[PDB]
Write a protein that binds this ligand. Structure first.
Ligand SMILES: *[C@@H]1O[C@H](CO)[C@@H](O[C@@H]2O[C@H](CO)[C@@H](O)[C@H](O)[C@H]2NC(C)=O)[C@H](O)[C@H]1NC(C)=O
Lengths: 49, 49
């Protein structure tokens, strides 16, 4: 959770973090790509029957 | 509608689409402290004869 890792609970921080653009969107997109591939890795090795 | 605003599209194909995030919120301020003691005699200077 980008907002909870950086800021952490505080709410005055959230308005400041929005000023850096879409860095938190990039982190979620990048990690989702990994998360989807790791299940496909397993299906390709074992689900051959 | 939150999913459509996350994707920036009006058509959402099938699958899990990680929208927001969540997190219950605190609801107090319990500020415990050490039962004070040495509590000065400001009276010495404020109540001299
Ligand atoms: C200022 O000093 C006077 C006395 O110097 C205090 O009066 C005493 O108060 C106690 C509290 O119950 C009584 O038992 C005494 O009999 C009082 N003595 C006299 C001579 O009146 C007074 O309380 C002090 N006030 C502050 C704010 O410190």
């Amino acid at each position: 959770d980008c907002t909870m890792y950086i800021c952490g609970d505080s709410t005055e921080c959230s308005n400041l973090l929005l000023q850096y653009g879409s860095f938190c969107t990039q982190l979620k997109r990048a990690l989702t790509g990994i998360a989807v591939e790791q299940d496909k890795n397993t299906q390709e090795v074992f689900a051959q029957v | 509608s939150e999913t459509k605003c996350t994707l920036k599209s009006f058509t959402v194909e099938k699958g899990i689409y990680q929208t927001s995030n969540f997190r219950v919120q605190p609801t107090e301020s319990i500020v415990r402290f050490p039962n004070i003691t040495n509590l000065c005699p400001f009276d010495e200077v404020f109540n001299a004869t």
